[PDB]
Design a protein around this nucleic acid. Structure first.
Lengths: 1341, 418
DNA sequence: ACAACCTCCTTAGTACATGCAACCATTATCACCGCCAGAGGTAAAATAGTCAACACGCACGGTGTTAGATATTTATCCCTTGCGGTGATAGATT
DNA sequence: AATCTATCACCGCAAGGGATAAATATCTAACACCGTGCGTGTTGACTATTTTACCTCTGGCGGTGATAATGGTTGCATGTACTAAGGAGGTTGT
């Protein structure tokens, strides 16, 4: 039982495991983050509002003024997404802020206040966002990628053997802010405890204990328990608490309480404490091996004589022990020297430190930022304390204070975004204690310790700094004015926070052009996870911390949805089901136990909790009147794995695709592929492009309907009802009183895109999927887009595939395609691209634009406006004009024996340079839009003023339909309220509305329900009373183009980039390669059906690719498409309606190992038949990745294709009628054509552009350049001994103007020879060397 | 910054530099190009040869002026093509596969005009370049001096630099699937549509009963050139195939037939060309390398070699092996807990058993992959050397290995951590 | 007497190669306003001219008639088809 | 390098299809006429083409203000991996 639009389309899952949750709308790290950056939140600590709440009220340091605040705002837009391409200006609107001022009694003592003033002011701009989760910035969808960074606070790592005079093994503690300056704590090479304040040069770690204000025995009371000795009746003894054995380098042997405890060699590292606490020990007796090397902590004396024995900070010795044996005063306080037990590094570095007090421990820090400059007393304190407590220079958020307290095992759920001058003691304790195993490293790449920084967080981090670095003239001049008579505004500049926040989405370190190759690519782009920028590193200044994998990726971040090459792992994607808590820690869905079984009481849990509860793996299985057929439940934790009994479990995974991101989640057999080709599969589906006759993945996962809606590329019934109009750009519906809101007309609208540019110059368009009078439910599909088939995804097309080598072309994932593909105009792609021109501010003001280029290429001119511009709808190719930027030439010399021809005898008209904008040599396809723009006081040019009436026609018509569509709902509600008792109301739905006022209904309140609706009507339609002009003067709008430009012009091209060789293709399972010949339908193998095969791809390569999902998609596609081919034949003869039902139902009904069923007996014998059209493409299939339709199910379903259930068939050759020495792999694969496009990249050159800087060629397609014969390319000619071919590149084909201008013409000499003159790039260098100051010249031989 | 680091004149503008009369595009396989040749789109030939056109119209009258000629040259009009045969018919184009860490990344050829926007590339040099057909590219350079063209034919030509500079096997060589064709023509079978049988005539693949695996036998008189230039004549009975016999058309018959009496995978085929280079002469060795190319393409397809779900056989007796290795581990993980191992030796004492499990299954795997036709002869049990394609992809040397086969026919085994 | 040697001091010299896509902003800062230049304005006359008047006078284009061409119709003619009779090929031998 | 018998078939040689070109009949176009109105001509009065003169714009640029204002800004070059050099100075040696 399936919906009303599903009567056209239903997908067949095969999966096996107990999901009770499905796809969430994939875009949240854009969407919810954009909201919380720009939300009026009353008590939160994030976004624009929290940035202002961290700086304002600015109660001035001058004590005479205050710039107060109330809240942000956004409002007052003018551009919209259409103008944000057609014009191009970033889709943005002004940030404005509520500000105030207050002043007090200057003169009296009984009123306390005297003045109060408050307003709004401007404070910047903000880009704007679509329902589709996109943004539009300089003509293009430039979009922020989210970051995955070390969580702010502190970290604790271990440089366990780096380098230098002892390969130095280390442990550390290191500050990492959300915003700010720095501090590290570690050890020097010699092994003193050391520090790097702001990570500058070496300082002894006692300095900061003086700065934070602790004297020597306070440092002991903060970091050291204190060892105790005695001497009793006949022996030496020590005195204890039952944890004081934690590090001892035990050369020695001990008993305590009543058994042996320590023995010769067994170093008592803190692991050992679990020998002692259980045993209540408070006294021990030891060899002298633990009664020296223990530094006495006070002075001691001898009443046997009247004398001393030793002083504080002194050792013990056999003679001192002999005097202690006499003493009377038989006690000693002593220090821990055992390493990590307490770290003696403090005690000893307290005597390897020149600093003495807090002033020295701040003055020496001033030197560490200002060598050779006087340490200005008060600024020596500020320079250090403002590293951690400044208005501009430190923050953590509540998130980073939480991580700080968490990595220190605190209980304070209370604290500050700043540090404190005593929090630092615990950072130092952890370093003193860690360094051989009281603990270990802070679990860095745990995905609840590394943290997400979403789009709105990445914008927030700028406002946490810009408000405390740039406001200078405001912060200055606020001190000076008598603000009883001046205002909370009077010095605020407005230029910078426009561009600096508009283009934070268009030129920022994470805000690239979105991957608009096709819908799947933009859907995953919106949830990309960068490891880069402030919080990570780059591609270059980075190791494997930015590229590899750590097991907490499970359920959260798929390790294969990354670019390839050196870019590996630097940017990733969020798995389908994954999200984050209020700390940006990553989380996942789970099933959960009640009374004895893993119930359907589903939950979500953090990466940290995956390290704290027993999660069963997706393997496990339920039972009859019992519990589990899974006797030995396989389980998992932190990303690791185990085996347990039933009596031991808390949770389980909900699905397998919870471990998988969008591109990877469409690979139906990852059960059978290596990661190196799964990586390719996660990118080839993204490089794929819109095609003229698109067709669906027949094999599939289920994501083939989610990814059709996860960016709105298909329109969907957000309310639903009955379809009421349908048009190639427009759709409307009507609704009923079960939903219809308290005064509406009962309507929705679902209009559709048409032709514009994109970020990889792909085409954009949409088309309907419903018709007049169809009822549709709240989730039915209403339209299609650039990569769909009538209600599901189509990133490509299906083709028949032979997995065999052919006559040479297909060696290395390279692809043969049939002539039949060109006949059907298939894998032809469609593109929309833009080209432009200018007229500069001259001394008058304008510049010329026309078509005059006489006797230079006349046919490439025939296609133009009066203004020198092509027409919308005209075809253009290879060299046609687009915008008439002609330029006259000159030659001028013209003396009585130099007037050789023109200026007397012929062509006595212009010599205009071929400088007008033209179609590039290789481009072909229709002009689709044309524009002209100017400084606004000039109302717009004739070619834009005709296009005003081209755009006005659409709205002038549509609003004349809309007004009728609107009142045909609204007055139909009034008509219905009348029909409820005044049943004769069809005498009224045939009148002017004013004449309904001669009426009445019944002696009951329906009468007054009619009255109040008739009163309300004249207010309601004021909605319509604007509409047409609200598009018009966005076209006739002007914009300034900066001083230097009066006007700008554009043309757009629909480039029909056809199927051709050298272009690139792929399939879902990581097969990727060039189209390497087009083959006649018989120049190809044919099946046991007596029928040829559309594509051929080499299997000899496959064992080096280590992947087999490509074979399984091909074989399951042979069943899936074979169902549709058999339907095309069966629909003709029909045989019996129960025979149409036999095959069409059996295609769905055939299964044996499955959670789902398209049970077509739960659908009627015409729902069976409306579905048959979209089944002629083939049967659509589903399979959660790792839950899938394995080989045995393919070998069952193939009894619908009815071809050999081996998947390996007696192929023939169309040219010869032969049949090969063995059966061969065949089927039908889902395949793709990819935006590498050789079509765009035909770049050769005879001669062209030259770099004035060096007389050498320029380089670039965007420069028509010459290309680099590199140093390695020289090594080949050197190695060959090929000196003339090498010298050719070095002068007569490059910078030597003399050489290249003679060699070009040396064909006219007939003697095609070299005639070089001087390598100008060496002539350049001979004067650059002299411009540095080095003299250089020549000799002769 | 004009000198010291990477961007300086020395490396950015001198020892390498941007260059005219040049271009780049995506590589495409060109199996009808002869070894001295390369394919180039007509409008790319037009672009690369403009100095021959805007440079000869004014030298034949074939346009009224170089200004008017805009209407004719960009048009690709008839008069362009005399002007270009006057180049093409004896002109060495240079080709390039940067980054050129080794000599054979740059070579010289001869134009052939084509359709499209690609660069078409002769299959035997695709190996010498390491050409990688994922929409990566190659580059083109036109030599224009008479001297550069003289030295390009003499010094850079593919036919004239065939061998490895490190030792002297060919790398301008019968390439990726070409050598499965040659291996297929030189493999033989039981039943074989010809368990022993012979014929000439390709048209007899259309007489009803033939195979390139059918087991020919023939006396062939055969010859071997001495260092002095005479011919050491020989004669022998043979045990051979139709494809091994067809290769006596292609073989330079001054070396003896008996060299073909084997299975010519990548393991072996280079050494025939190497032996020709050691003994006969340059032209004979070039023709023997070139003509083997189309010989591969006529028959590589007709092998029907594949990868597919029953090209992936598995040893049944893996069942018995799991009753050893997983059971050895099962007591050893108790011996740790009962006090007879620590946690550490126990890691080795189980990883070594996982290695021994993989290597046990890898023995059974080879019997099933290569011979297990058991049913008990007479009238049964063709226990022959297998025709499994994944095995043939390794014994041809086409692209397979034991490390691929383990993952595809028995056990994927073990891995490294980061 | 100097020599280099022990140690960790800091300094700072480098970081492979080919190619394609993109768009060109931010500052504030009294320039004051006083003087007078040749220098802007414009009246009245040089360097010379407008276009309306009443004449002058002609070209061009559209309405009309004529011309002849063309595309139709007709019907003729030849070159071609397909089969058949039997050809001197292909090529092995002389 | 000549001979032919014995292939697979082109000729051996009947039929018939389309063609095109003749004659007819239609179309249009080319023209010659006529009529319109414009750009045929000189003359004359206008007013503002240009010049120079005069009286009096715009913008050249030079000149420098005073209740008093008298310890400043500036943020991140870089945390890595190497290792060659110079710098330090005490001393155990040359």
């Amino acid at each position: 039982v399936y919906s009303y639009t599903e009567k056209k389309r239903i997908r067949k899952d095969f999966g096996k495991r107990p999901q009770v949750l499905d796809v969430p709308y994939l875009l949240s790290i854009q969407l919810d983050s954009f909201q919380k950056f720009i939300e009026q939140d009353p008590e939160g600590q994030y976004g624009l509002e929290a940035a202002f709440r961290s700086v304002f009220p600015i109660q001035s340091y001058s004590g005479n003024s205050e710039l107060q605040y109330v809240s942000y705002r956004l409002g007052e837009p003018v551009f919209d997404v259409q103008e944000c391409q057609i014009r191009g200006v970033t889709y943005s609107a002004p940030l404005r802020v509520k500000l105030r001022l207050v002043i007090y009694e200057r003169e009296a003592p009984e009123g306390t206040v005297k003045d109060i003033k408050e307003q709004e002011v401007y404070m910047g701009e903000i880009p704007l966002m679509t329902d589709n989760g996109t943004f539009v910035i300089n003509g293009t969808e430039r979009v922020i990628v989210s970051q995955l960074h070390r969580s702010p606070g502190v970290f604790f790592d271990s440089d366990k053997g780096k380098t230098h005079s002892s390969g130095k093994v280390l442990y550390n503690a290191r500050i990492i802010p959300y915003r700010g300056s720095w501090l590290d704590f570690e050890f020097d090479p010699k092994d003193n405890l050391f520090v790097r304040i702001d990570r500058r040069r070496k300082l002894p770690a006692t300095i900061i204990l003086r700065a934070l204000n602790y004297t020597t025995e306070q440092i002991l009371d903060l970091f050291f328990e204190k060892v105790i000795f005695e001497i009793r009746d006949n022996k030496l003894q020590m005195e204890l608490v039952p944890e004081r054995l934690r590090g001892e380098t035990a050369s020695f042997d001990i008993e305590a309480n009543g058994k042996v405890y320590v023995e010769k060699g067994r170093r008592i590292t803190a692991r050992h404490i679990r020998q002692l606490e259980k045993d209540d020990v408070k006294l021990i007796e030891v060899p002298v091996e633990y009664i020296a090397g223990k530094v006495v902590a006070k002075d001691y004396i001898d009443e046997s004589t009247g004398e001393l024995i030793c002083a504080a900070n002194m050792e013990l010795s056999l003679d001192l022990l002999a005097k202690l044996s006499q003493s009377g005063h038989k006690r000693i306080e002593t220090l821990f020297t055992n390493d990590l037990d307490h770290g003696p590094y403090i005690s000893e570095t307290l005597r390897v430190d020149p600093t003495n007090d807090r002033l020295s421990a701040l003055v020496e820090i001033y030197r560490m930022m200002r060598p050779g400059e006087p340490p200005t007393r008060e600024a020596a304190e500020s320079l250090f304390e403002n590293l951690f407590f400044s208005e501009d220079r430190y923050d953590l958020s509540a998130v980073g204070r939480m991580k700080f307290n968490r990595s220190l095992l605190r209980e304070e759920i209370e604290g500050s975004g700043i540090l404190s001058k005593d929090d630092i003691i615990d950072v130092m304790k952890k370093l003193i204690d860690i360094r051989n195993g009281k603990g270990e490293v802070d679990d860095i790449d745990h995905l609840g310790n590394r943290r997400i920084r979403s789009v709105g967080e990445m914008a927030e981090n700028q406002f946490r700094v810009g408000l405390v670095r740039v406001e200078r003239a405001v912060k200055e001049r606020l001190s000076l004015g008598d603000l009883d008579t001046l205002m909370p505004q009077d010095m605020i500049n407005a230029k910078p926070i426009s561009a600096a926040v508009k283009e934070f989405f268009g030129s920022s370190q994470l805000s690239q052009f979105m991957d608009q190759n096709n819908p799947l690519s933009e859907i995953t782009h919106k949830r990309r996870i960068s490891a880069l920028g402030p919080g990570g590193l780059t591609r270059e200044r980075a190791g494997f911390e930015v590229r590899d994998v750590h097991p907490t990726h499970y359920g959260r971040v798929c390790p294969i949805e990354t670019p390839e090459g050196p870019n590996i792992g630097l940017i990733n994607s969020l798995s389908v089901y994954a999200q984050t808590n209020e700390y940006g820690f990553l989380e996942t869905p789970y099933r959960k136990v009640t009374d004895g079984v893993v119930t359907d009481e589903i939950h979500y849990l953090s990466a940290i909790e995956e390290g704290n509860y027993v999660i069963a793996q997706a393997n496990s299985n339920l039972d009859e009147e019992g519990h589990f057929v899974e006797d030995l439940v396989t389980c998992r934790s932190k990303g690791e794995s185990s085996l347990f009994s039933r009596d031991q479990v808390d949770y389980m995974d909900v699905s397998t695709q919870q471990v998988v991101s969008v591109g990877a989640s469409l690979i139906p057999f990852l059960e059978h592929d290596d990661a190196n080709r799964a990586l390719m599969g996660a990118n080839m589906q993204r490089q794929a492009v819109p095609t003229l006759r698109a067709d669906k993945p027949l094999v599939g996962t289920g994501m083939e309907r989610a990814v059709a809606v996860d960016s709105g590329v298909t329109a969907v019934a957000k309310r639903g009802g009955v379809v009421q109009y349908v048009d190639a750009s427009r759709i409307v519906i009507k609704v009923n009183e079960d939903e219809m809101y308290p005064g509406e007309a009962g309507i929705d609208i679902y209009n559709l895109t048409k032709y514009t540019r994109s970020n990889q110059n792909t085409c954009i368009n949409q088309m309907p999927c419903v018709s007049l009078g169809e009822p549709v439910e709240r989730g039915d599909v209403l339209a299609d887009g650039p990569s769909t088939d009538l209600g599901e995804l189509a990133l490509g097309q299906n083709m028949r595939v032979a997995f065999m080598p052919w006559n040479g072309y297909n060696f290395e994932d390279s692809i043969l395609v049939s002539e039949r593909v060109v006949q059907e105009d298939r894998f032809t792609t469609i593109h929309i691209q833009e080209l432009a021109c200018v007229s500069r501010d001259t001394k008058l003001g304008p510049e010329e634009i026309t078509a005059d280029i006489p006797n230079v290429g006349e046919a490439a001119l025939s296609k133009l406006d009066e203004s020198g511009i092509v027409y919308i709808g005209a075809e253009v190719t290879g060299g046609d004009i687009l915008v008439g930027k002609v330029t006259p030439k000159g030659e001028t010399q013209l003396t009585p024996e130099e007037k050789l021809l023109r200026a007397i005898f012929g062509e006595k008209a212009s010599d205009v340079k071929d400088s007008s904008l033209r179609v590039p040599n290789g481009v072909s396809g229709t002009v689709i839009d044309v524009q002209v723009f100017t400084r606004d006081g000039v109302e717009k040019d004739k070619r834009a003023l005709e296009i005003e009436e081209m755009q006005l026609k659409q709205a002038k018509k549509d609003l004349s339909e809309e007004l009728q569509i609107l009142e045909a709902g609204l007055f139909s509600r009034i008509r219905a309220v009348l029909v409820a008792g005044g049943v004769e109301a069809e005498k009224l739905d045939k009148l002017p509305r004013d004449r309904w006022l001669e009426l009445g209904l019944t002696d009951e309140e329906k009468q007054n329900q009619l009255e109040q609706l008739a009163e309300q009507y004249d207010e309601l339609k004021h909605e319509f009373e604007k509409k047409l002009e609200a598009k018009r003067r966005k076209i006739t709008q002007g914009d300034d183009l900066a001083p230097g430009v009066l006007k700008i012009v554009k043309v757009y091209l629909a480039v029909k980039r056809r199927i051709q060789p050298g272009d690139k293709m792929a399939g879902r399972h990581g097969n990727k390669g060039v189209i390497s010949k087009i083959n006649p339908i018989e120049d190809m193998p044919y099946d046991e059906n007596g029928t040829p095969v559309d594509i051929v791809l080499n299997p000899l390569g496959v064992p080096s690719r280590m992947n087999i999902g490509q074979i399984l998609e091909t074989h399951l596609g042979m069943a899936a498409k074979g169902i549709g081919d058999k339907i095309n034949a069966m629909l003709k003869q029909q045989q019996e309606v129960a025979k149409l039902r036999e095959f069409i139902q059996r295609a769905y009904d055939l299964g044996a190992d499955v959670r789902q069923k398209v049970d077509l007996s739960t659908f009627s014998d015409e729902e069976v038949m409306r579905l048959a059209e979209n089944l002629r493409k083939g049967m659509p299939i589903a399979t959660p990745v790792f839950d899938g339709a394995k080989e045995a199910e393919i070998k069952e379903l193939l009894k619908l294709g009815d071809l050999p259930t081996s998947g390996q068939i007696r192929l023939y050759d169309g040219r010869t009628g032969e049949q090969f020495e063995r059966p061969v792999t065949v089927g039908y694969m889902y395949m793709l054509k990819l935006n590498h496009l050789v079509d765009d990249k035909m770049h050769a050159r005879s001669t062209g552009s030259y770099s004035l800087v060096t007389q050498q060629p320029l380089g670039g397609k965007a420069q028509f350049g010459g290309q680099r014969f590199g140093e390695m390319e020289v090594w080949a000619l050197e190695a060959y001994g090929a000196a003339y071919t090498l010298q050719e590149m070095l002068t007569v084909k490059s910078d030597d103007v003399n050489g290249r201008t003679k060699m070009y013409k040396n064909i006219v000499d007939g003697n095609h020879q070299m005639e070089p003159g001087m390598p100008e790039s060496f002539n350049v260098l001979l004067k650059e060397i002299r411009s540095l100051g080095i003299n250089i010249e020549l000799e002769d031989e | 910054d004009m000198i010291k680091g990477k961007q300086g004149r020395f490396r950015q503008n001198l020892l390498g530099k941007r260059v005219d009369y040049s271009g780049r595009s995506v590589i495409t396989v060109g199996p009808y190009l002869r070894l001295h040749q390369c394919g180039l789109p007509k409008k790319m030939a037009l672009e690369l040869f403009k100095p021959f056109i805007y440079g000869k119209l004014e030298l034949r009258g074939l346009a009224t002026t170089i200004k008017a000629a805009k209407k004719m040259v960009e048009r690709e009009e008839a008069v362009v093509w005399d002007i270009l045969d006057e180049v093409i018919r004896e002109h060495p184009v240079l080709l390039n596969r940067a980054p050129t860490l080794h000599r054979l990344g740059i070579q010289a050829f001869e134009p052939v005009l084509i359709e499209g926007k690609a660069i078409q590339l002769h299959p035997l040099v695709c190996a010498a370049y390491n050409a990688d057909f994922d929409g990566d590219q190659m580059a083109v350079h036109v030599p224009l001096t008479l001297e550069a063209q003289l030295e390009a034919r003499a010094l850079m030509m593919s036919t004239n630099n065939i061998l490895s500079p490190a030792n002297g096997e060919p790398i301008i060589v019968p390439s990726q699937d070409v050598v499965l064709g040659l291996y297929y023509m030189t493999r033989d079978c039981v039943n074989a549509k010809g368990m022993v049988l012979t014929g000439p005539a390709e048209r007899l693949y259309r007489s009803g009963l033939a195979s390139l695996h059918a087991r020919v036998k023939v006396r062939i008189t055969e010859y071997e050139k001495d260092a002095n230039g005479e011919l050491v004549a020989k004669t022998s009975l043979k045990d051979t195939t139709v494809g091994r016999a067809i290769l006596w058309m292609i073989v330079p018959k001054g070396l003896p037939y008996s060299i073909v009496n084997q299975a010519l995978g990548k393991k072996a085929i280079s050494k025939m060309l190497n032996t020709c280079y050691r003994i006969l002469g340059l032209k004979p060795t070039v023709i023997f390398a070139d003509q083997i190319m189309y010989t591969g393409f006529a028959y590589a397809a007709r092998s029907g070699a594949s990868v597919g779900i029953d090209d992936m056989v598995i040893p049944e007796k893996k069942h018995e092996i799991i009753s050893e290795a997983e059971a050895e581990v099962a007591e050893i993980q108790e011996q740790f807990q009962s006090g007879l191992v620590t946690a550490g030796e126990r890691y080795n004492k189980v990883i070594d058993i996982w290695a021994a499990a993989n290597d046990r299954v890898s023995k059974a795997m080879m019997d099933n992959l290569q011979t297990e036709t058991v049913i008990n002869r007479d009238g049964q049990e063709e226990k022959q050397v297998s025709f499994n394609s994944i095995y043939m992809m390794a014994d041809s040397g086409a692209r397979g290995s034991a490390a691929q086969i383990r993952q595809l026919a028995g056990m994927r085994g073990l891995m490294a951590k980061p």
